[PDB]
Symmetry: C5
Subunit: 238 residues, 5 copies
């Protein structure tokens, strides 16, 4: 349930941290790597009262990335301490850290201005499914977007939502407000069992006016498989 | 056969994975390099039930790139597992990635709106020919393209096709729909025995209105020769 | 006293130097790394008086960065000599640079044209807070900005200031004039205990007309926590 | 002798392959490096029946580049095999590729439409000179260029030529048609004993209408000295 | 005299070569590094007849840059051979390049069109100053600039000059014409004892109409201290 809180409540920080494993890790004996894995598992357990850590295998799906953590915390200083500790582990010392993005959860700004049927439909957000694919797309809006007033942006966001309606059940969505914490305005996060549905969702959105106000979209677009930390780290241990 | 199903059927994922051999590979004794080559060959055979792996010599034709795999799979999870295993082999650990792109095969979007005679012409796609050149060109369309309605895009794609007609036999083509899986919209893939024919094809298409709408075209443009994997890997065993 | 002077007076150079520890550092014997950390602490101590060095933990908050120095000096030569001496330490030898930016403090250009009530409220600048978050955002203005006359720019800066007013207490600010010393026009620096306040501040400023004139905004946006240097370097001697 | 043919006939591929030497090359004993230089010279001699290889010293004139080959071949397959063999030599194993561009020679497209006097003038193409400077400028045209009718492009290319006329004797020129083989449309190649004349030529062309149609010009602009291969390789055997 | 002629005469090539020292240079024993640094001074003296070499400490002022040479020669082949010879010293063997730019000195294009008073003012160029700061800014003009007639460009350059007149004494300047020798049109070089003056000069020039014709300005903007070589060399021997 407290996990559920971190994943759904407003005012929670989400951090996305990507890493590559060094060649000399694999040039290491599996026995020492099995110990290294236990160390990391230990550290995550240690931090489990303060933060939520979820793990994703990017190796073979995202260029120049092997591992991603999605970390939820009420204070970014907690996230900093965990990540710093993680990077100083025996395993962490052989990771080449890559990307790092942060954003905060907020109560919706526009939904209140939508038609009742659309507000009702928006109650649906993903479905049951084990070990889904996950996608992360950072976005920066253009200056023209911010110059628009709230009514105009509400209209454009209604169009966005309208195009997305066929994907409410098949794609789980989460939005993080990132401006000022790194070089992007939003971090978008998705889970799906059906990548072709996600692909179709993005194509649908490409047609809407709001999608013309993206100064930057992706770079990187991170694609991975969601799974237990143990299961991923085990692959790294063999 | 099932090879052909994977190469022709809709709903199949194609993955393009580029690699460059690190120089420290060459410090390994030749005998050790011989054994490492053998290991990759067996991994590929182990995966021969689930996925199709084809290999291309980029060395000496594409900057900063030695090897490309084109992998077809019904589930990207399988491609992930194969590439992660490959990257973990001793040969694999001495490769750096030069790119990783994915897309899905789809039934055509525009062809049904084409004249009936054009639909018939598109039944031809390449001809028999051993060890052709292969070219891969990633493409990202501009926002203006997606803003156009279906009728407009159909007419633009009819013009594209019209310009391409002389090349239907001499250049084999395949299109992958990539949006949402990486930072491009399409991966285009070609085979040809005559590069000057491919050059002339691209020149013909540069004139059509659909061309201005290519926000990104190439970067990289990958040029290689299609080859059995053993002959590529032999070079690194010398 | 003299520290407070360096931090508030005009004609003072502020330099922002970012560093990341290389891996092969962690291959050096433990007590070897304990001793190398001692060198840096004495080096920073020596240069006191001449220059002011403040340290920030970027590890786990900024991508590819562990440490940032903010250095204040009346003579940029002095900063050069310190940084070069720092980079030459055994610890320094294992660091890669993730950025180097300079700017000078100046008496305000526009404030004299603001309403008296605004001049008065700008007397507030942050509040007492230990170990705050720190954010650094480099900014390059477009050519159209410099083409505007002083009256036009004054109005735009009044609008900027108006949007920022709610945040005067909770966000400390400092501006550095950078044009000609590197590839940006300004370095902006902020401290806060409340990151969502800083986020909301930047969102407020995105709407003002002055914003569209930022040709470059961030790249990198640096986020860290203010810390004594010994606590940062400690992490590398584990 | 067929050398003259490869350098002048249509349908021939020119390839520009740039390399930078690893720093660890210098840790090798001089004796080892002497042997490795013989291996490269002999490889070029072995290939001299099939392809033409010319060598250029870029060290000290082009950033991040020591050596360039210009290779002419009837098929790129032969060039691929040569360059792959070259990269497999003892010396080649220590080189990092800094560029690889290909294009074909073609009979002129526009010259037939020029005045008779211009046609006659164009028969002059450089003059005798030992060890000239060489410059390679890759060029990509904008979409607007390809949208222009042939008559319009002819007029633009006549203006280009008109501006270049003063330089026919002091600057040798060669054009390669590259579209589809890499990320550029043209590779331009020049030889001159007088770099100020080449500078002044490019300045003359910057004013012509055809200039604005360059989406990309240079990046890199390669500057080198043409030299016997043995003289370039001697530097590395020191 | 000979020095002064190279620094003042037309038709002289100026080369700007930037270098960054490898990390593993410090893994080397102190005495090994002591000998290494000794042979560089003798090389410069060897070349004292043909070329002028001046040295600048970039370490701690310019990102990813330790040393710059400004080299003047009447033949760029000479500079090549010096820099090639330099990069093949035990010290040079450990240098990675961070930039290489060339340009030629020319008699002014526009000054003859200025008012006689402005012509007289331009006779002033800086003042004798020991160990000044040095700044290097590469510039590329847009196509629109080259499309303007001579009369129009003269007016724009008079405006440039007018804005710069207050800085004639405190900022020394030199202009190199670079087009065709690398990817920029101009190299600008400045010496000053007073960085805030230089900063203020660039600010004045940002306002003039000629400024919005700079397609590229900086990237990199190099900042350094002009220094005897021994003073830079010494730091690498610690
Ligand atoms: C079924 C899937 C989706 C649904 C139902 C959906 C719906 C919404 C809704 C209702 C909002 C407004 C939230 C608010 O009021 O504060 C929103 C914001 C946003 N969405 Fe989506 N979306 C989906 C998929 C996507 C995708 C695939 C992207 C891009 C990859 C995306 C990008 C964004 C961005 C950048 C914002 C923030 C815009 C702003 O607040 O200024 N969405 N979305
Ligand atoms: C014989 C050569 C070619 C033929 C016959 C051809 C034909 C076609 C056809 C019929 C379509 C529409 C598919 C649909 O309805 O979904 C298409 C799409 C496409 N073609 Fe080609 N093409 C050829 C060569 C090329 C080349 C050389 C390129 C670029 C290097 C290219 C780029 C594309 C792209 C990016 C699309 C997707 C456009 C979109 O759906 O928005 N094609 N092509
Ligand atoms: C409490 C928050 C802030 C206040 C009170 C504030 C106020 C001001 C004032 C009064 C000036 C004009 C200084 C002068 O007259 O020379 C100024 C300049 C500037 N501010 Fe802010 N600002 C705040 C936050 C921010 C933020 C968050 C950013 C961007 C990340 C920013 C960017 C700038 C820049 C680039 C300038 C220089 C503009 C120019 O001189 O052309 N400010 N600010
Ligand atoms: C003595 C010097 C030069 C002469 C006589 C010259 C002449 C020509 C001629 C006659 C053509 C047309 C060939 C054809 O009909 O197919 C051409 C093409 C071209 N030239 Fe030059 N040129 C010179 C220098 C340059 C320079 C310095 C550059 C750029 C660095 C350049 C860039 C190009 C390009 C990109 C084309 C191909 C344009 C196209 O076919 O669309 N040329 N030149
Ligand atoms: C006291 C300082 C300066 C003075 C007196 C000055 C004056 C001049 C003059 C008279 C010319 C014309 C040369 C000719 O006729 O060929 C010129 C050209 C040029 N100046 Fe400056 N300048 C100063 C500072 C700067 C600065 C700070 C920059 C840029 C960072 C700069 C950039 C240039 C450029 C790029 C040109 C060549 C423009 C062209 O010929 O198209 N100058 N400058």
């Amino acid at each position: 349930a407290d996990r559920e809180k971190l994943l759904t409540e407003s005012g929670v920080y989400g951090t996305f941290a990507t890493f590559q494993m060094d060649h000399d890790w694999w040039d290491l004996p599996g026995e020492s790597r099995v110990i290294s894995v236990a160390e990391v598992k230990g550290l995550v357990e240690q931090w489990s009262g303060k933060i939520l850590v979820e793990s994703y295998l990017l190796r073979g799906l995202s260029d120049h990335a092997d591992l991603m953590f999605r970390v939820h915390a009420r204070t970014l200083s907690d996230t900093q301490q965990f990540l710093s500790a993680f990077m100083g582990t025996r395993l962490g010392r052989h990771l080449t850290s890559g990307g790092l993005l942060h954003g905060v959860s907020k109560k919706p700004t526009y939904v209140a201005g939508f038609p009742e049927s659309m507000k009702t439909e928006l109650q649906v957000n993903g479905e049951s499914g084990s070990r889904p694919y996950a996608i992360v797309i950072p976005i920066k809006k253009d200056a023209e977007w911010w110059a628009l007033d709230q009514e105009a942006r509400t209209a454009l966001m209604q169009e966005h939502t309208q195009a997305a309606l066929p994907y409410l059940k098949t794609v789980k969505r989460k939005l993080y407000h990132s401006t000022g914490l790194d070089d992007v305005d939003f971090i978008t996060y998705f889970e799906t069992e059906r990548l072709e549905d996600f692909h179709n969702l993005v194509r649908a959105l490409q047609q809407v006016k709001e999608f013309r106000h993206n100064r930057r979209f992706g770079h990187p677009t991170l694609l991975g498989t969601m799974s237990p930390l143990d299961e991923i780290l085990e692959k790294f241990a063999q």
